[PDB]
């Protein structure tokens, strides 16, 4: 078996989950268009009653230029004109723990 769920049983499992989730449905026929309209109005769902979306749409210069000129040839700060994650520190911690644990045996 190995795996927790063989794909070929996915349809049966989903069918049983659906059966458990929706135990009662509305299976009463209507007789004319007005009844269908009323039933559609009555069964409305808040999560499926939104509206259609909206169409998608599209003096200091001297100071800025002076700063840009003054930052000439700056390797790192010039490009910007920053989300630390401490990855090197965590790598160091992991390696230190592994080395200490290995030294425990010896």
């Amino acid at each position: 078996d190995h795996m927790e769920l063989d794909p070929k049983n996915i349809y049966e499992v989903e069918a049983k989950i659906l059966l458990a989730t929706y135990p009662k449905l509305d299976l009463e026929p209507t007789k004319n268009a007005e009844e269908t309209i009323a039933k559609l109005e009555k069964l409305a769902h808040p999560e499926h009653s939104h509206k259609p979306p909206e169409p998608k749409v599209r003096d200091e210069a001297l100071a800025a230029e002076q700063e840009r000129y003054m930052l000439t040839l700056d390797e790192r700060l010039s490009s910007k004109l920053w989300e630390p994650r401490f990855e090197r520190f965590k790598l160091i911690e992991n390696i230190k723990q592994e080395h200490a644990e290995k030294k425990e045996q010896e």
Binding site: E4, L5, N9, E12, V13, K16, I17, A20
Partner: peptide
């Protein structure tokens, strides 16, 4: 067994255990 899988899934999901019409109808019957 599918029953075991379904039960496990459900447990892990926190599932607790007006007059014109009448006139026309009458005329048509008549």
């Amino acid at each position: 067994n599918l029953n075991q899988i379904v039960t496990d899934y459900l447990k892990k999901k926190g599932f607790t255990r007006k007059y014109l019409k009448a006139f026309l109808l009458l005329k048509n019957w008549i």
